[PDB]
Nucleic acid binder design. Structure first.
Length: 100
RNA sequence: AGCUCUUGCAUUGCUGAAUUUUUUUUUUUUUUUUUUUUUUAAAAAAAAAAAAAAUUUUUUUUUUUCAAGUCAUCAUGGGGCUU
């Protein structure tokens, strides 16, 4: 067995979501990474239901040296792929982005 | 200038040995999506998927060490020789 905490996890959770909002609307790039296989289809659901162009997702294994960027991959496999943003390909295949 | 004179423990080259076995695991073509360089365009880069596959009658080819051998293969350093 191990620890629990209700107030801290809610506070940290709302805190991290506000952190995601500021880094997103300051024009950065957000990557969501979880390499546990059981929760991968939920991440596919999120990767199909997302709307903003800057949230990115990864579900497979973590390759050795992903963020090393030693050889110029222009960013590694978690970065800019159709796997990273599956929604961007389909949203542009439909052609209509939520655009004004 | 010429040595078939020496020195393979001065050498180049070439080879011996067993070190007898390893020489397929790796790319390329195509697709999709996207982005790097240049005043109407190619490459380039990145994520994924599919196929093509790797020379010759089947052995050659790739291989580490012995001052291993050869100055008579030619060469050539040194020394010797030229009634």
């Amino acid at each position: 067995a191990l620890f629990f905490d209700p107030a801290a996890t809610l506070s940290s959770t709302m805190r991290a979501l506000h952190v995601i909002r500021q880094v997103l609307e300051k024009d950065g790039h957000v990557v969501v990474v979880n390499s546990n296989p059981r929760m991968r289809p939920l991440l596919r659901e999120a990767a199909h239901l997302c709307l903003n162009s800057n949230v990115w997702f990864w579900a497979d294994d973590w390759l050795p040296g992903c963020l090393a960027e030693t050889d110029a991959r222009g960013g590694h496999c978690p970065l800019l792929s159709d796997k990273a943003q599956p929604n961007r390909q389909i949203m542009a295949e439909k052609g209509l982005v939520f655009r004004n």
